[PDB]
Design an enzyme around this catalytic site. Structure first.
Site, PDB file in Angstrom:
ATOM      1  N   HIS A  62       0.818  -1.232   0.000  1.00  0.00           N
ATOM      2  CA  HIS A  62       0.000   0.000   0.000  1.00  0.00           C
ATOM      3  C   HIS A  62       0.850   1.280   0.000  1.00  0.00           C
ATOM      4  O   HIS A  62       0.648   2.120  -0.863  1.00  0.00           O
ATOM      5  CB  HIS A  62      -1.000   0.066   1.171  1.00  0.00           C
ATOM      6  CG  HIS A  62      -1.669  -1.238   1.484  1.00  0.00           C
ATOM      7  ND1 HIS A  62      -1.622  -1.813   2.736  1.00  0.00           N
ATOM      8  CD2 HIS A  62      -2.389  -2.085   0.709  1.00  0.00           C
ATOM      9  CE1 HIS A  62      -2.286  -2.956   2.719  1.00  0.00           C
ATOM     10  NE2 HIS A  62      -2.761  -3.143   1.501  1.00  0.00           N
ATOM     11  N   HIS A  92       2.871   9.459   5.503  1.00  0.00           N
ATOM     12  CA  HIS A  92       3.024   8.626   4.319  1.00  0.00           C
ATOM     13  C   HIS A  92       2.593   9.437   3.109  1.00  0.00           C
ATOM     14  O   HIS A  92       2.075  10.550   3.242  1.00  0.00           O
ATOM     15  CB  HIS A  92       2.150   7.373   4.421  1.00  0.00           C
ATOM     16  CG  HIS A  92       0.694   7.676   4.592  1.00  0.00           C
ATOM     17  ND1 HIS A  92       0.097   7.927   5.805  1.00  0.00           N
ATOM     18  CD2 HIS A  92      -0.284   7.831   3.665  1.00  0.00           C
ATOM     19  CE1 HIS A  92      -1.190   8.229   5.580  1.00  0.00           C
ATOM     20  NE2 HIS A  92      -1.477   8.185   4.291  1.00  0.00           N
ATOM     21  N   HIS A  94       0.955   9.192  -1.184  1.00  0.00           N
ATOM     22  CA  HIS A  94       0.146   8.499  -2.169  1.00  0.00           C
ATOM     23  C   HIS A  94       0.746   9.124  -3.429  1.00  0.00           C
ATOM     24  O   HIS A  94       1.016  10.331  -3.444  1.00  0.00           O
ATOM     25  CB  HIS A  94      -1.334   8.871  -2.044  1.00  0.00           C
ATOM     26  CG  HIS A  94      -1.961   8.433  -0.754  1.00  0.00           C
ATOM     27  ND1 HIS A  94      -2.594   7.228  -0.576  1.00  0.00           N
ATOM     28  CD2 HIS A  94      -2.006   9.049   0.453  1.00  0.00           C
ATOM     29  CE1 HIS A  94      -2.989   7.148   0.710  1.00  0.00           C
ATOM     30  NE2 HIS A  94      -2.661   8.230   1.390  1.00  0.00           N
ATOM     31  N   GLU A 104      -4.728  12.405  -3.792  1.00  0.00           N
ATOM     32  CA  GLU A 104      -6.035  11.844  -3.469  1.00  0.00           C
ATOM     33  C   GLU A 104      -7.049  12.979  -3.602  1.00  0.00           C
ATOM     34  O   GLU A 104      -8.055  12.857  -4.299  1.00  0.00           O
ATOM     35  CB  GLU A 104      -6.015  11.226  -2.070  1.00  0.00           C
ATOM     36  CG  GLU A 104      -5.088  10.003  -2.021  1.00  0.00           C
ATOM     37  CD  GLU A 104      -5.521   8.976  -1.025  1.00  0.00           C
ATOM     38  OE1 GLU A 104      -5.497   9.259   0.183  1.00  0.00           O
ATOM     39  OE2 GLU A 104      -5.896   7.876  -1.451  1.00  0.00           O
ATOM     40  N   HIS A 117       0.431  12.798   3.726  1.00  0.00           N
ATOM     41  CA  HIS A 117      -0.527  12.783   4.817  1.00  0.00           C
ATOM     42  C   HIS A 117       0.213  12.667   6.145  1.00  0.00           C
ATOM     43  O   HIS A 117       0.953  11.694   6.359  1.00  0.00           O
ATOM     44  CB  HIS A 117      -1.486  11.583   4.677  1.00  0.00           C
ATOM     45  CG  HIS A 117      -2.405  11.672   3.497  1.00  0.00           C
ATOM     46  ND1 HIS A 117      -3.001  10.546   2.943  1.00  0.00           N
ATOM     47  CD2 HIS A 117      -2.830  12.778   2.834  1.00  0.00           C
ATOM     48  CE1 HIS A 117      -3.762  11.002   1.967  1.00  0.00           C
ATOM     49  NE2 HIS A 117      -3.693  12.341   1.860  1.00  0.00           N
ATOM     50  N   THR A 196      -8.614   7.276   3.912  1.00  0.00           N
ATOM     51  CA  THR A 196      -8.787   7.002   2.492  1.00  0.00           C
ATOM     52  C   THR A 196      -8.457   5.560   2.117  1.00  0.00           C
ATOM     53  O   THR A 196      -8.440   5.213   0.931  1.00  0.00           O
ATOM     54  CB  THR A 196      -7.972   7.966   1.627  1.00  0.00           C
ATOM     55  OG1 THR A 196      -6.579   7.772   1.885  1.00  0.00           O
ATOM     56  CG2 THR A 196      -8.354   9.417   1.937  1.00  0.00           C
TER      57      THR A 196
HETATM   58  N1  LIG Z   1      -4.315   7.908   3.839  1.00  0.00           N
HETATM   59  S1  LIG Z   1      -4.956   8.449   5.301  1.00  0.00           S
HETATM   60  O1  LIG Z   1      -6.408   8.641   5.296  1.00  0.00           O
HETATM   61  O2  LIG Z   1      -4.293   9.613   5.875  1.00  0.00           O
HETATM   62  C1  LIG Z   1      -4.722   7.192   6.573  1.00  0.00           C
HETATM   63  C2  LIG Z   1      -4.092   7.436   7.790  1.00  0.00           C
HETATM   64  C3  LIG Z   1      -3.926   6.425   8.732  1.00  0.00           C
HETATM   65  C4  LIG Z   1      -4.372   5.132   8.511  1.00  0.00           C
HETATM   66  C5  LIG Z   1      -4.146   4.058   9.570  1.00  0.00           C
HETATM   67  O3  LIG Z   1      -3.559   4.447  10.577  1.00  0.00           O
HETATM   68  N2  LIG Z   1      -4.525   2.680   9.521  1.00  0.00           N
HETATM   69  C6  LIG Z   1      -4.624   2.053  10.848  1.00  0.00           C
HETATM   70  C7  LIG Z   1      -5.745   1.297  11.242  1.00  0.00           C
HETATM   71  C8  LIG Z   1      -5.884  -0.046  10.759  1.00  0.00           C
HETATM   72  F1  LIG Z   1      -4.969  -0.587   9.942  1.00  0.00           F
HETATM   73  C9  LIG Z   1      -7.042  -0.807  11.173  1.00  0.00           C
HETATM   74  C10 LIG Z   1      -8.028  -0.215  12.058  1.00  0.00           C
HETATM   75  C11 LIG Z   1      -7.867   1.136  12.530  1.00  0.00           C
HETATM   76  C12 LIG Z   1      -6.733   1.893  12.127  1.00  0.00           C
HETATM   77  F2  LIG Z   1      -6.605   3.148  12.580  1.00  0.00           F
HETATM   78  C13 LIG Z   1      -5.014   4.858   7.300  1.00  0.00           C
HETATM   79  C14 LIG Z   1      -5.201   5.865   6.326  1.00  0.00           C
HETATM   80 ZN   LIG Z   2      -2.863   8.737   3.160  1.00  0.00          ZN
END
Ligand SMILES: NS(=O)(=O)c1ccc(C(=O)NCc2c(F)cccc2F)cc1
Ligand SMILES: [Zn+2]
Ligand SMILES: [Hg+2]
Length: 258
Positions: A62, A92, A94, A104, A117, A196
């Protein structure tokens, strides 16, 4: 199967395992500059990253995350549309397979080369796990990257990518200063949204900077050489790990500038 960004497990398929994908406050969204409401009651953002302690960088399939020590109020985000203090936990990007796509969020339908992000969680909740179950649990600072001149502060990140080429690989990444990634202006747009990527939880207050940072072609090129796959598996280049814009629905994008 497990979610991804390919033809068979991409964004259009996420709704099957994560119903929230067709929710009311999904991200990203397109920012229509002529419809965003200037809100003079919005406070300036307060970014305090002087005591930031980065620890590790890892390829999780990812994307690649640079993690920070969030056991104390070391690097925080306050102000803007936020109530309370949010601790930075990771950042991170994208990006796309070509310079014309990768972001995004889009501005007036314009896609940028990539998007950064900076993820923060609301300290009132004790830990990130609790925070993701709340409407105001996370605050993500979004910064667009345009291809042009090199960004010095990004080079340390770029040089270490060879060490984490495949999924599951990590490298010690201490003493990185995230302040080197911020543009000079802190003007922004803000709206309630979601993560996202799956779980796609609707617990995010999005703060998108108006001013993009510029990175060189060579710098972006290196992001594109990472792999989605783990070691030993068939090579699948990590490119286009972005979700297309979602419908705004009953939401309003506010702007901190006129
Ligand atoms: N691209 S973005 O929107 O900024 C974004 C930021 C953080 C996360 C994340 O921390 N995943 C953790 C996570 C899991 F992998 C499972 C359940 C809850 C979680 F917070 C995902 C997307
Ligand atoms: Zn992100
Ligand atoms: Hg939530």
């Amino acid at each position: 199967h497990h979610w991804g960004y390919g033809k068979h497990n991409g964004p259009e398929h996420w709704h099957k395992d994560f119903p929230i994908a067709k929710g009311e406050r999904q991200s990203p969204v397109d920012i229509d500059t002529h419809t965003a409401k200037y809100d003079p009651s919005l406070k300036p953002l307060s970014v305090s990253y002087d005591q930031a302690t980065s620890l590790r960088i890892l390829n999780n399939g990812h994307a690649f995350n640079v993690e920070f020590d969030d056991s104390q109020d070391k690097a925080v985000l306050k102000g803007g549309p936020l109530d309370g203090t949010y601790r930075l936990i990771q950042f991170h990007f994208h990006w796309g397979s070509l310079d014309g796509q990768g972001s995004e969020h889009t501005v007036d339908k314009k896609k940028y080369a990539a998007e950064l992000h900076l993820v923060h969680w609301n300290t009132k909740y004790g830990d990130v796990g609790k925070a993701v179950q709340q409407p105001d649990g996370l605050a993500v600072l979004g910064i667009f990257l345009k291809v042009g001149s090199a960004k010095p502060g990004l080079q340390k990140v770029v040089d270490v990518l060879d060490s984490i080429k495949t999924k599951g690989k990590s490298a010690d990444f201490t003493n990185f200063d995230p302040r080197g990634l911020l543009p000079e202006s802190l003007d922004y747009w803000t709206y309630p949204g979601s993560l996202t990527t799956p779980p796609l939880l609707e617990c995010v207050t999005w703060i998108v900077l108006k001013e993009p940072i510029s990175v060189s072609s060579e710098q972006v090129l290196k992001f594109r050489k990472l792999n989605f796959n783990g070691e030993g598996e068939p090579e699948e280049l990590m490119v286009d790990n972005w979700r297309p814009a979602q419908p705004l629905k009953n939401r309003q994008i506010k702007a901190s500038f006129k």
